Amino acid sequence: KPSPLLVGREFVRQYYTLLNQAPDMLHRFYGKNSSYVHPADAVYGQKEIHRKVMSQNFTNCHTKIRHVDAHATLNDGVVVQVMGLLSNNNQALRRFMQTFVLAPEGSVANKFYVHNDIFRYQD
């Protein structure tokens, strides 16, 4: 397997660059059982997760990563906590945490999908 922290870095790097460059492409990352939570309830699956992402109207979304923990978890998966600051559509940088369970896609090596995605602003 590749270092968890490496899967962690690369997914992280990859995710909110999508949030700034193409939210409309974020869905690709998610399975059928994948939950996405932005309390607010979970949408499930690629189709609704897209609908929710486009609803948040992510605009000029700069993102500051202040830490990343990423650990091997069951099924040769990786859990991930990101602590960070996120502004959107030109709002003030707000603090937040985001928890991800990334899980192996199965068919294809070194490929993961997001199985859980939990985001909560602290403010």
Partner: peptide, 9 residues
């Protein structure tokens, strides 16, 4: 091949 990648099953 050794590229870490992401996508749904």
């Amino acid at each position: 091949a050794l590229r870490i990648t992401f996508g749904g099953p």
